[PDB]
Design an enzyme around this catalytic site. Structure first.
Site, PDB file in Angstrom:
ATOM      1  N   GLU A  35       0.822  -1.207   0.000  1.00 26.38           N
ATOM      2  CA  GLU A  35       0.000   0.000   0.000  1.00 26.38           C
ATOM      3  C   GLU A  35       0.861   1.266   0.000  1.00 26.38           C
ATOM      4  OE1 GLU A  35      -3.087   0.346  -0.571  1.00 26.38           O
ATOM      5  OE2 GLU A  35      -4.061  -1.570  -0.113  1.00 26.38           O
ATOM      6  N   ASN A  46      -7.651   9.244  -5.654  1.00 24.14           N
ATOM      7  CA  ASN A  46      -8.480   8.329  -6.422  1.00 24.14           C
ATOM      8  C   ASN A  46      -9.250   9.094  -7.489  1.00 24.14           C
ATOM      9  OD1 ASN A  46      -9.105   7.068  -3.166  1.00 24.14           O
ATOM     10  ND2 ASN A  46      -7.669   6.177  -4.650  1.00 24.14           N
ATOM     11  N   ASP A  48     -12.213   9.210  -8.077  1.00 26.93           N
ATOM     12  CA  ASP A  48     -13.480   9.710  -7.549  1.00 26.93           C
ATOM     13  C   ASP A  48     -13.355  10.946  -6.661  1.00 26.93           C
ATOM     14  OD1 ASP A  48     -13.073   8.736  -4.707  1.00 26.93           O
ATOM     15  OD2 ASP A  48     -13.022   6.823  -5.787  1.00 26.93           O
ATOM     16  N   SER A  50     -11.618  11.179  -3.787  1.00 25.74           N
ATOM     17  CA  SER A  50     -11.151  10.829  -2.448  1.00 25.74           C
ATOM     18  C   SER A  50      -9.644  10.620  -2.476  1.00 25.74           C
ATOM     19  CB  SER A  50     -11.845   9.566  -1.944  1.00 25.74           C
ATOM     20  OG  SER A  50     -11.506   8.455  -2.767  1.00 25.74           O
ATOM     21  N   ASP A  52      -6.271   8.407  -0.499  1.00 25.83           N
ATOM     22  CA  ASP A  52      -5.752   7.390   0.423  1.00 25.83           C
ATOM     23  C   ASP A  52      -4.581   7.940   1.245  1.00 25.83           C
ATOM     24  OD1 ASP A  52      -7.607   5.678  -0.780  1.00 25.83           O
ATOM     25  OD2 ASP A  52      -6.116   4.580  -1.937  1.00 25.83           O
ATOM     26  N   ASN A  59      -8.883   5.367   3.016  1.00 29.75           N
ATOM     27  CA  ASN A  59      -9.609   6.221   2.067  1.00 29.75           C
ATOM     28  C   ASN A  59     -10.515   7.254   2.745  1.00 29.75           C
ATOM     29  OD1 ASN A  59     -11.062   7.231  -0.146  1.00 29.75           O
ATOM     30  ND2 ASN A  59     -11.179   5.239  -1.161  1.00 29.75           N
TER      31      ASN A  59
END
Ligand SMILES: [Cl-]
Ligand SMILES: [Mn+2]
Ligand code: NA
EC number: 3.2.1.17
Length: 129
Positions: A35, A46, A48, A50, A52, A59
């Site tokens: 990750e 992301n 969309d 958002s 991380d 998220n």
């Protein structure tokens, strides 16, 4: 902070992640490697909108507030910035809620794709825990 492999395993163990929800330590270390490459300051946007955050790339869509994810939730009740600290408390405590949400470690796409079913004990082999 960029953790060494064994340093992070030990940190995670002290914070109660070993066998948390039945997930052995090596699973958490493997997930953090893929990750964030063990980097606490890791962030990724992301498509969309958002973002991380942190060693486990939690998220902002569901778990933390960053003030710029329209219509999102804050189920860990923390600023997302708290997930970037050298101290892993905030990340670990949020991870605990996430892993208990019904899907286990599958919530971490990289865990499902790269760690799940593999020899995860290799990630802690040789470490003084
Ligand atoms: Cl599970
Ligand atoms: Mn600590
Ligand atoms: Na949010």
């Amino acid at each position: 902070k960029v953790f060494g492999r064994c340093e992070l395993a030990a940190a995670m163990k002290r914070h109660g992640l070993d066998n948390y929800r039945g997930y052995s330590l090596g699973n958490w270390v493997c997930a953090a490697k893929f990750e964030s490459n063990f980097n606490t300051q890791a962030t990724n946007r992301n498509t969309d909108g958002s973002t991380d955050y942190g060693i486990l790339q939690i998220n902002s869509r569901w778990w933390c507030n960053d003030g710029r994810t329209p219509g999102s939730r804050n189920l860990c009740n923390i600023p997302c910035s708290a997930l970037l600290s050298s101290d892993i408390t905030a990340s670990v405590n949020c991870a605990k809620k996430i892993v208990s949400d019904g899907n286990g470690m599958n919530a971490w796409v990289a865990w499902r794709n790269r760690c799940k079913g593999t020899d995860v004990q290799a990630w802690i082999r040789g470490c003084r825990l």
